[PDB]
Symmetry: D2
Subunit: 416 residues, 4 copies
Amino acid sequence: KTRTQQIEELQKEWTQPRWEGITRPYSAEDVVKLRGSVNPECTLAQLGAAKMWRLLHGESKKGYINSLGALTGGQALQQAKAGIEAVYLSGWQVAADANLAASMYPDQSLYPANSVPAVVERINNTFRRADQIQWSAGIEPGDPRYVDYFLPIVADAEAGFGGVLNAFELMKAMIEAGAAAVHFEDQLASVKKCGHMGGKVLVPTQEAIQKLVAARLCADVTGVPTLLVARTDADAADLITSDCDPYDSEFITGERTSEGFFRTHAGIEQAISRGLAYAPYADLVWCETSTPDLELARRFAQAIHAKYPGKLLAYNCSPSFNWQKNLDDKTIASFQQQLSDMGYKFQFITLAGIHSMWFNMFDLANAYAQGEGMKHYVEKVQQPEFAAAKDGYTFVSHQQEVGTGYFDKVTTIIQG
Amino acid sequence: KTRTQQIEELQKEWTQPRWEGITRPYSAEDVVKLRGSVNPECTLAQLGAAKMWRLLHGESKKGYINSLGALTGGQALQQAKAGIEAVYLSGWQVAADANLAASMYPDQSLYPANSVPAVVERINNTFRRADQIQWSAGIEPGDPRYVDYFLPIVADAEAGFGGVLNAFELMKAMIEAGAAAVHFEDQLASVKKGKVLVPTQEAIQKLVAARLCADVTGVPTLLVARTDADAADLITSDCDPYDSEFITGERTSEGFFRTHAGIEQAISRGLAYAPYADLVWCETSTPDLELARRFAQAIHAKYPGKLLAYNCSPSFNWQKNLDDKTIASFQQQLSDMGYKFQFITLAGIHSMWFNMFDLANAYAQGEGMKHYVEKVQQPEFAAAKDGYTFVSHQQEVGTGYFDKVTTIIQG
Amino acid sequence: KTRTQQIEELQKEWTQPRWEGITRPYSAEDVVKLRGSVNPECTLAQLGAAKMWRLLHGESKKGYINSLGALTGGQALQQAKAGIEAVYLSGWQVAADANLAASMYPDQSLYPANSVPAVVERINNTFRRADQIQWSAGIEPGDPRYVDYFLPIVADAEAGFGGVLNAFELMKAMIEAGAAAVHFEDQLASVKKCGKVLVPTQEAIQKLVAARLCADVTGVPTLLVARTDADAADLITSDCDPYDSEFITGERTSEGFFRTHAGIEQAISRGLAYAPYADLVWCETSTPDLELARRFAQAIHAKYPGKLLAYNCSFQQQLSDMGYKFQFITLAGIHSMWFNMFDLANAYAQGEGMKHYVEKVQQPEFAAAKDGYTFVSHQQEVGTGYFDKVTTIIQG
Amino acid sequence: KTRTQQIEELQKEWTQPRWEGITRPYSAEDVVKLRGSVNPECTLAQLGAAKMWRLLHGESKKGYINSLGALTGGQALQQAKAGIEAVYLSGWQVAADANLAASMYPDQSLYPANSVPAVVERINNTFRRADQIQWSAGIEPGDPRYVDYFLPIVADAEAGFGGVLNAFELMKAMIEAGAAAVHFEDQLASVGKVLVPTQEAIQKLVAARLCADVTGVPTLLVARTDADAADLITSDCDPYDSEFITGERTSEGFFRTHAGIEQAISRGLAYAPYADLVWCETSTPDLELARRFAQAIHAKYPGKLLAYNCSPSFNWDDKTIASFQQQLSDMGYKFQFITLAGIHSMWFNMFDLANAYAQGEGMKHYVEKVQQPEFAAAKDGYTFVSHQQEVGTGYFDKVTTIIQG
Ligand SMILES: [Hg+2]
Ligand SMILES: [Hg+2]
Ligand SMILES: [Hg+2]
Ligand SMILES: [Hg+2]
Ligand SMILES: [Hg+2]
Ligand SMILES: [Hg+2]
Ligand SMILES: [Hg+2]
Ligand SMILES: [Hg+2]
Ligand SMILES: [Hg+2]
Ligand SMILES: [Hg+2]
Ligand SMILES: [Hg+2]
Ligand SMILES: [Hg+2]
Ligand SMILES: [Hg+2]
Ligand SMILES: [Hg+2]
Ligand SMILES: [Hg+2]
Ligand SMILES: [Hg+2]
Ligand SMILES: [Hg+2]
Ligand SMILES: [Hg+2]
Ligand SMILES: [Hg+2]
Ligand SMILES: [Hg+2]
Ligand SMILES: [Hg+2]
Ligand SMILES: [Mg+2]
Ligand SMILES: [Mg+2]
Ligand SMILES: [Mg+2]
Ligand SMILES: [Mg+2]
């Protein structure tokens, strides 16, 4: 395709409804000059981004997408079998038990920058195998047992691991691996303040914006309409690294710490001002929260929507607290539905996969180690599995689940 | 430390009780010429082997070690916290969800040969973090709240991924990562159509190559010889006269020779591998007591006290029969037969995959937070009384430890 | 695309000239059932295959492709700049200084099976960068200074590291990483007893088939090179294949291997058996011998006229006339690297340090500039200017 | 070993000559509390650190150590056979052709942080193999042909890839892989170059020293300053920098400073008490410029080890070109190195070879450019002529032999 042809096709694409309300501080010619003469296709990223966009605009089963953090390809596989519509890939879970340094870390961006994309690839590879198994058995799209295994993957890009070029390279790796959406945040975890009423440190609004622009540019160069999730940690961060951006002057207290940080007035107002600033550069806005407060959620949503009506929002929980300690059972039950009616169409439990995994190993192990080992394995795992069969669980047939049937057909064809 | 002194040491070490009944077809001098002038220490491998040996000879709580396959450092950590004494690292689980090709594979040796070792390192790194957290908090060995995190790791080396040098290099990767014990099998999974065995002498050479690597590194790693002869009715060649009684003479189109699958063949291989390994294992698909008693009696008629290992996948609805009473005492009856190391190979993957399915099937339907509270958070809070500490997730992964490191540096 | 539709597109493509004379023991239907509902695009593999084919059928500059083994993306970069048309990726070099076990090994298939594909990926990434630098600076295709950086990569899959499924997975890795051609051999390197050991003919054929099936499943027309080590191997693992009976003496070794009559006659029967399943046939050799080369070629062409051959290295022109259209020195990259490092360091260690660096490297680099060598400007070569543009665009 | 014994041994060790002039803002008890009850041995790191220290204190052949940037284990191997006493591992070379993202990058800390440590491991493994070959052939320390393959490795940690914890973890990976020395800098390539406040740069040097102490290995720490060409600084939080801070702030919010040898010297003097070596990065080779820095450093810290580099992006009179490294040695620059020697050697020669080869009469140029010169060099110690042996074919043949009885 000629350069001029590529420029014209982009200019036209940015007029499409997918890009309504999105701001780009660069031109189509800027994008096309960074591509090179050959631009490799990223099939899974293309499919994931398209699918995610549709689910967020009327095709989800419940009107909203609710996800659970997953740290292995196999956890994501079971989610797809259970009916989950999008996979959430948590950086925290990766730091603790699935990173490339092969170490257990706390959530402070200590792992090698290419660790999340590595997990994205594992998940997509698992999805491909399942799809192959299914296709080779002749079960085709639109069959009474046809499971669509390619769930869009939402991945945690932390703060980009450095400057704008670092965020640019990480975005590229996420896309090449097949992620459907990526989230960037405005706190600098690498410099969290120690001691004295310390905590998370924000970067100036402008710096956080350049990272979103860096991720959008990389996406545009590759030609995939990847969803960009702008996250703000300003609700709880009362420290900023600098006062260079006039937009933040109203939250700057004047006091300075020994590191050179400037104190700010933390709270929903600062969160709202970050939310509004990132809105035109992202497809989804997320305001990090630590408590299940429906009223605060409404307020945050109303504020963003007064300026950007219909803007898509995301809502999380780790969860770090005891929901039952904070709320009554009926509110716990209708929590996600209420959020959805406020505009939170993407909701998730960030650490569900690790809590699920670690707790169940502990539970089985604890009984097993005391004796009567096989009875515990039978009562805690096998019996529950047989009962789950009715619901779509097929791992009871463990050889087939991992491709044994698929590879047998390969073998038979080769020696055919 | 010089060559002669190294030679002298080895010779003396081999007269120690650890090596009783063990045959090595080479010399101490052969071992030392393969070492180099500098031989890096393997602290974790050393500690795990010595501990694993002690547990198998009287220091285990129940008289036997019962394990569960783990595929993440975190699963292992929870086992350590629950009182498990050794970690079993299954090749099947790695092929399915934790290998270096980042792909889901069936159990046919398709993943890159350095994958199990990578998981060993992950596990030991998880244990190193837990131990540091504990130590930083002032809790030391002897202290009643001290938890010994360095559980010996038993790893799956399949058939070595090639010839003797491949097996030699794999053993080496295993030891440098810190495995305490390693198992090698006599089937050739790269051709599973049923299972296919290699000649008895070929299997023995792989065991020899593994033992040689360990002696070169200088670590007493435990070697587990596994035989798949109970289910293998094919052999690659008739070159070994030891195998002639099971070879009928019939050859298949692939050039393989038919044999007679059964405990008789299993017994023959077990007897041949015995003098070369610390433990002997006859892989089974059916957890069957009479079969197990028959195998152990056979081995023990010839090598009294030989330590055995027993596994189960286990197969679907296997308990479908044995009465509940046989199911509950199953592991104790085995221990009395000599099976001191028992393990459920796919426990970890079943545990993980099923629970994710269970949580997600309910959550995808609605009332999402209720299901999370009822299936996870509530049960977690109730297990805190038993030693589960992940209820406080930030402390578990080292936030407190690293915050302290930051503090020492800043001030 | 529909299953049936996919099946039809496959039947039709197998009638095209690209596949004349190639045998496939399976059906299109078989191929399609293994694909899945989604088959990711492999852009670089497609381009590499299409280009390697065209170069072998009239578009090379000299009527033949001569390559040099490369072990780093940078080495490949310099080759592209100097005018080479195809990159040769040696497994021996990978085993010695570029494998995923991070160790130095002899050539005995000791390294992790995904190691070669990892280097294929590095080379392709280096090429993408050079291309981006050139494109971002305006130089477009057809420019009097435009260098086509996407050189087809020929990579060594050894014996596929195990059975038919491992070869299948290895081929998949090669293709996903962007290889244009891959070679499989009939010796079992993991068993070189204290010479070479061949596997029955049917076994080597099963691997060629597995390799071709994966390429067909991916939809990429990757070139498959069948290599035979039978010219020097006098040992075989088994006598199960009737086709090999005439070379088998009956003598058997302590390992249970059968002695065979090695020589060109053994190489010719393997060459002939593999011909229909491969795009190129290669009978590995150690010394340049035109008469031997002429004999192997006449024997293959008597049954498969036109069959392209590969030649492990006016010498070159006659070979080319005989059909040896792909010629290469497998270990050039490592000899080039280690020798020059030794040269430079030997002198440097003695004294007059900067003088030796200037005469052995700087001066010569300067003279090189006139021939298309651009690394004298190393900040630019590595993309400092490309990322400068990225930065500039993001910040305004 | 007891917590108490550990603290005690640690204290006595800090009074040893290895540590004179070095400041540690933390106590022995702090170190031991971060260790864990089991502390795995780091054999290669111990050997390389001890050896590097000895070389720098009289045991080198020429009075100074001159190195060349290497990016593959094989390149290091040839340096060992060539007489080089220390291996230099450049981050620039790693960015361009040997990083874990498998991509070619400019030198702006864009590659995965565990990339350099991965190359350290490759180099040490190659050395292990070369040593095994030798030992298995009966050759031992003292044999007229015995080569000491374990050269200390000097490795580039750039700026630690983040905050103090990233720097801590990076150092941990360098030591576990077996590096003998590591360099950290005060610029922010992630951001001409921008410097960080002096206290921050120092915090990274302490983070690295702390990890080494916890591991129990006396690793060498090289403090590098980029202040000779840096006119920007991220903040004015450190009074120690106040005199170079002009007052004019940039649009990014960075502050302008007065760049020059005077800036480098103050960074140089501020890092001295925390590093084992001090290095003031340089673009142009000026002896006088190098003399002022050295003298200036020594006024306050007599006999402080200094390091000096050459890209050389340059284009170097012949007499001064030939005595250059001899003169620096006299100023106190005991560790000298050509950072990109490795990549230019490799890339240029492949260009030279391929260029000739592509034209025609290929076999001819290969023989003339590589093979003939290799035979000629065998005389001087080059052994790759016998390539099967160099990589261990003979060592693995012995293994096979012992195994099959
Ligand atoms: Hg892509
Ligand atoms: Hg603090
Ligand atoms: Hg990009
Ligand atoms: Hg600013
Ligand atoms: Hg919020
Ligand atoms: Hg939530
Ligand atoms: Hg070790
Ligand atoms: Hg070893
Ligand atoms: Hg035999
Ligand atoms: Hg059995
Ligand atoms: Hg069992
Ligand atoms: Hg692909
Ligand atoms: Hg394939
Ligand atoms: Hg056969
Ligand atoms: Hg030949
Ligand atoms: Hg040649
Ligand atoms: Hg270590
Ligand atoms: Hg450390
Ligand atoms: Hg400061
Ligand atoms: Hg300087
Ligand atoms: Hg220099
Ligand atoms: Mg996160
Ligand atoms: Mg297994
Ligand atoms: Mg090869
Ligand atoms: Mg550097």
